[PDB]
Design an enzyme around this catalytic site. Sequence first.
Site, PDB file in Angstrom:
ATOM      1  N   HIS A  78       0.816  -1.280  -0.473  1.00 37.48           N
ATOM      2  CA  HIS A  78       0.191   0.412   0.033  1.00 37.48           C
ATOM      3  C   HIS A  78       0.740   0.866   0.278  1.00 37.48           C
ATOM      4  O   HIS A  78       0.489   1.938   1.019  1.00 37.48           O
ATOM      5  CB  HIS A  78      -1.011   0.020   1.134  1.00 37.48           C
ATOM      6  CG  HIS A  78      -1.781  -0.801   0.929  1.00 37.48           C
ATOM      7  ND1 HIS A  78      -1.911  -2.270   1.692  1.00 37.48           N
ATOM      8  CD2 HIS A  78      -2.893  -1.125   0.792  1.00 37.48           C
ATOM      9  CE1 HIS A  78      -3.268  -2.684   1.458  1.00 37.48           C
ATOM     10  NE2 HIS A  78      -3.861  -2.362  -0.153  1.00 37.48           N
ATOM     11  N   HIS A 118      -6.244   7.252  -3.427  1.00 41.81           N
ATOM     12  CA  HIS A 118      -7.296   6.817  -2.724  1.00 41.81           C
ATOM     13  C   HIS A 118      -6.124   5.409  -1.676  1.00 41.81           C
ATOM     14  O   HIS A 118      -7.238   4.571  -0.552  1.00 41.81           O
ATOM     15  CB  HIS A 118      -7.220   5.276  -3.715  1.00 41.81           C
ATOM     16  CG  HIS A 118      -6.842   3.861  -3.718  1.00 41.81           C
ATOM     17  ND1 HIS A 118      -5.778   4.255  -4.533  1.00 41.81           N
ATOM     18  CD2 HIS A 118      -7.240   3.256  -3.032  1.00 41.81           C
ATOM     19  CE1 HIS A 118      -5.788   2.744  -4.616  1.00 41.81           C
ATOM     20  NE2 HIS A 118      -5.978   2.726  -4.069  1.00 41.81           N
ATOM     21  N   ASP A 119      -5.624   5.603  -1.991  1.00 39.50           N
ATOM     22  CA  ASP A 119      -4.620   4.945  -0.376  1.00 39.50           C
ATOM     23  C   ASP A 119      -3.331   5.485   0.568  1.00 39.50           C
ATOM     24  O   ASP A 119      -2.992   4.452   0.834  1.00 39.50           O
ATOM     25  CB  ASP A 119      -4.404   3.235  -0.595  1.00 39.50           C
ATOM     26  CG  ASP A 119      -4.620   2.351  -1.098  1.00 39.50           C
ATOM     27  OD1 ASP A 119      -5.777   2.276  -0.059  1.00 39.50           O
ATOM     28  OD2 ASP A 119      -4.743   0.826  -1.456  1.00 39.50           O
ATOM     29  N   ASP A 236      -8.586  -1.032  -8.494  1.00 38.75           N
ATOM     30  CA  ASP A 236      -7.421  -1.964  -6.999  1.00 38.75           C
ATOM     31  C   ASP A 236      -7.347  -3.131  -6.823  1.00 38.75           C
ATOM     32  O   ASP A 236      -6.881  -3.056  -6.356  1.00 38.75           O
ATOM     33  CB  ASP A 236      -8.668  -1.126  -6.056  1.00 38.75           C
ATOM     34  CG  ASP A 236      -7.908  -0.721  -4.736  1.00 38.75           C
ATOM     35  OD1 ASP A 236      -6.839  -0.579  -4.591  1.00 38.75           O
ATOM     36  OD2 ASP A 236      -8.414  -0.688  -3.219  1.00 38.75           O
ATOM     37  N   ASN A 239      -4.941  -6.125 -10.401  1.00 41.52           N
ATOM     38  CA  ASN A 239      -2.872  -7.206 -10.310  1.00 41.52           C
ATOM     39  C   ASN A 239      -3.199  -8.605 -10.673  1.00 41.52           C
ATOM     40  O   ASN A 239      -2.874  -8.825 -11.808  1.00 41.52           O
ATOM     41  CB  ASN A 239      -2.431  -7.412  -8.505  1.00 41.52           C
ATOM     42  CG  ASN A 239      -2.466  -5.908  -7.597  1.00 41.52           C
ATOM     43  OD1 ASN A 239      -2.224  -6.217  -6.639  1.00 41.52           O
ATOM     44  ND2 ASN A 239      -2.541  -4.955  -8.429  1.00 41.52           N
ATOM     45  N   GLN A 287      -4.249 -17.287  -3.230  1.00 40.36           N
ATOM     46  CA  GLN A 287      -4.647 -16.371  -4.682  1.00 40.36           C
ATOM     47  C   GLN A 287      -5.606 -16.689  -5.420  1.00 40.36           C
ATOM     48  O   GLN A 287      -6.717 -16.019  -5.927  1.00 40.36           O
ATOM     49  CB  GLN A 287      -3.277 -16.583  -5.620  1.00 40.36           C
ATOM     50  CG  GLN A 287      -2.462 -15.239  -5.055  1.00 40.36           C
ATOM     51  CD  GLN A 287      -2.814 -13.775  -4.881  1.00 40.36           C
ATOM     52  OE1 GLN A 287      -3.398 -13.660  -6.043  1.00 40.36           O
ATOM     53  NE2 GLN A 287      -3.061 -13.528  -3.721  1.00 40.36           N
ATOM     54  N   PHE A 290      -9.130 -15.741  -2.988  1.00 38.55           N
ATOM     55  CA  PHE A 290      -8.970 -14.361  -3.960  1.00 38.55           C
ATOM     56  C   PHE A 290      -9.829 -14.192  -5.276  1.00 38.55           C
ATOM     57  O   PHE A 290     -10.376 -13.766  -5.573  1.00 38.55           O
ATOM     58  CB  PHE A 290      -7.249 -13.744  -3.217  1.00 38.55           C
ATOM     59  CG  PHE A 290      -7.523 -12.290  -3.830  1.00 38.55           C
ATOM     60  CD1 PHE A 290      -8.311 -11.112  -3.161  1.00 38.55           C
ATOM     61  CD2 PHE A 290      -6.507 -11.575  -4.739  1.00 38.55           C
ATOM     62  CE1 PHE A 290      -8.469  -9.951  -3.104  1.00 38.55           C
ATOM     63  CE2 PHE A 290      -6.806 -10.484  -4.380  1.00 38.55           C
ATOM     64  CZ  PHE A 290      -7.883  -9.431  -4.355  1.00 38.55           C
TER      65      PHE A 290
HETATM   66  C1  LIG Z   1      -7.136 -14.210   1.050  1.00 42.61           C
HETATM   67  O1  LIG Z   1      -6.672 -14.087   0.081  1.00 42.61           O
HETATM   68  C2  LIG Z   1      -5.419 -13.365   0.553  1.00 42.61           C
HETATM   69  C3  LIG Z   1      -5.206 -13.653   2.177  1.00 42.61           C
HETATM   70  C4  LIG Z   1      -3.598 -13.280   2.259  1.00 42.61           C
HETATM   71  C5  LIG Z   1      -3.139 -12.385   1.550  1.00 42.61           C
HETATM   72  C6  LIG Z   1      -3.215 -12.160  -0.045  1.00 42.61           C
HETATM   73  C7  LIG Z   1      -4.736 -12.236  -0.170  1.00 42.61           C
HETATM   74  C8  LIG Z   1      -5.466 -12.070  -1.337  1.00 42.61           C
HETATM   75  O2  LIG Z   1      -4.183 -11.430  -1.613  1.00 42.61           O
HETATM   76  C9  LIG Z   1      -4.656 -10.021  -2.153  1.00 42.61           C
HETATM   77  C10 LIG Z   1      -5.399  -9.629  -1.151  1.00 42.61           C
HETATM   78  C11 LIG Z   1      -5.452  -8.349  -1.646  1.00 42.61           C
HETATM   79  C12 LIG Z   1      -6.349  -7.318  -0.652  1.00 42.61           C
HETATM   80  N1  LIG Z   1      -7.874  -7.916  -0.033  1.00 42.61           N
HETATM   81  N2  LIG Z   1      -8.064  -7.746   1.091  1.00 42.61           N
HETATM   82  C13 LIG Z   1      -9.031  -8.764   2.088  1.00 42.61           C
HETATM   83  C14 LIG Z   1      -7.353  -9.309   2.616  1.00 42.61           C
HETATM   84  C15 LIG Z   1      -8.204 -10.437   3.753  1.00 42.61           C
HETATM   85  C16 LIG Z   1      -8.896 -11.329   2.662  1.00 42.61           C
HETATM   86  C17 LIG Z   1      -9.479 -11.371   1.268  1.00 42.61           C
HETATM   87  C18 LIG Z   1      -9.789  -9.975   0.698  1.00 42.61           C
HETATM   88  C19 LIG Z   1      -9.721  -9.356   1.307  1.00 42.61           C
HETATM   89  C20 LIG Z   1      -7.508  -6.647   0.682  1.00 42.61           C
HETATM   90  O3  LIG Z   1      -8.247  -5.516   0.804  1.00 42.61           O
HETATM   91  C21 LIG Z   1      -6.892  -6.337  -0.444  1.00 42.61           C
HETATM   92  C22 LIG Z   1      -7.300  -5.633  -1.474  1.00 42.61           C
HETATM   93  C23 LIG Z   1      -5.219  -5.300   0.049  1.00 42.61           C
HETATM   94  C24 LIG Z   1      -4.763  -7.524  -2.681  1.00 42.61           C
HETATM   95  C25 LIG Z   1      -3.786  -7.790  -3.835  1.00 42.61           C
HETATM   96  C26 LIG Z   1      -3.950  -9.284  -3.397  1.00 42.61           C
HETATM   97  O4  LIG Z   1      -2.909  -9.706  -4.062  1.00 42.61           O
HETATM   98  C27 LIG Z   1      -2.344  -9.183  -5.267  1.00 42.61           C
HETATM   99 MG   LIG Z   2      -7.191   0.790   0.333  1.00 40.70          MG
HETATM  100 ZN   LIG Z   3      -5.555   0.075  -2.865  1.00 41.50          ZN
END
Ligand SMILES: COc1ccccc1COc1cc(C2=NN(C3CCCCCC3)C(=O)C2(C)C)ccc1OC
Ligand SMILES: [Mg+2]
Ligand SMILES: [Zn+2]
Length: 329
Positions: A78, A118-119, A236, A239, A287, A290
């Site tokens: 961030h 935004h961040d 946002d 990625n 990943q 997600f």
């Molecule tokens: C369950 O998924 C993850 C668990 C642990 C590590 C990473 C992940 C997925 O990898 C990413 C996650 C996020 C975000 N996820 N979240 C949160 C995190 C917790 C639950 C999942 C969604 C909500 C966010 O706010 C941001 C946008 C920062 C952003 C880019 C990512 O990869 C490039």
């Molecule tokens: Mg943010």
């Molecule tokens: Zn962001």
Amino acid sequence: GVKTEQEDVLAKELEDVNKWGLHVFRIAELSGNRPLTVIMHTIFQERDLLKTFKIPVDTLITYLMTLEDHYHADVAYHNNIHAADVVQSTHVLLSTPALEAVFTDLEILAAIFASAIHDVDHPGVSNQFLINTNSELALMYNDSSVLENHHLAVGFKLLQEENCDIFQNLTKKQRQSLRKMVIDIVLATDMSKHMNLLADLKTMVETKKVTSSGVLLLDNYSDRIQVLQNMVHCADLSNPTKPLQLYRQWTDRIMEEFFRQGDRERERGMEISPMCDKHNASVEKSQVGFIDYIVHPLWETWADLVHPDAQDILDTLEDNREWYQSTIP
Ligand SMILES: COc1ccccc1COc1cc(C2=NN(C3CCCCCC3)C(=O)C2(C)C)ccc1OC
Ligand SMILES: [Mg+2]
Ligand SMILES: [Zn+2]
């Protein structure tokens, strides 16, 4: 009055500013860690935003340097590179053929300014962390969209810095409209809003009207702001839609940030956070989860709204997902 060679190598990378998968880490390197400033400046010049909003160029550079310097260099994900990436990704989404001439210059300025701020001043830990630590920010914002409220307050407060008011020539009407849209967009970046945003975008795709051209019709603020909110939210969460060379760099960074929140969460106890544990916590499944649960349903619905403009992006996401799936031992 000619570029240095590094300035020139940077100018050549910035020729990719209109493309999905810009070499944003390389721009960060070539610019001396100034990706947000050089990318915002390039986009403002390309969209002629300086003339349209009568923004003095030195005021624009002063604010952008000030804004970038309020991103934490000691935070792996961030930071100002992420800000630059969401700016440049929002910029490409705004250029999508399904939205040609839909948005006004003020709506465009709002989406891009929203993306830049935004961040800003992200401490590298989550809203839940700040709430559970009794942090000043959580107390200031009565535990509600804590970071998102802070990013807004900082992004706006920085306009008062010596020669930083980039909006100094806008009418009161322009600034009130711009400010409301910027607030609505950034607050929409809070992940607790994701399911409501996606529901409203799905509703929008079902009721989808279209114009004399193939261009979306949006005839009310509710609809216009919802599209801009979901656009920047897509940027946002973009990625996993990028080439793997990029996606992987972002994953490493989010994991460093998450493991380091993980580290602090251990000697403070409150209990560890969703797969934020360098131990019983696997990267590849995190990943795939997600993408399956958040990113794919969002980007598929976005892909529906602007069909077929987002086809290549959705494919890259599905390959990346298959890639992470394949690597699970
Ligand atoms: C369950 O998924 C993850 C668990 C642990 C590590 C990473 C992940 C997925 O990898 C990413 C996650 C996020 C975000 N996820 N979240 C949160 C995190 C917790 C639950 C999942 C969604 C909500 C966010 O706010 C941001 C946008 C920062 C952003 C880019 C990512 O990869 C490039
Ligand atoms: Mg943010
Ligand atoms: Zn962001």
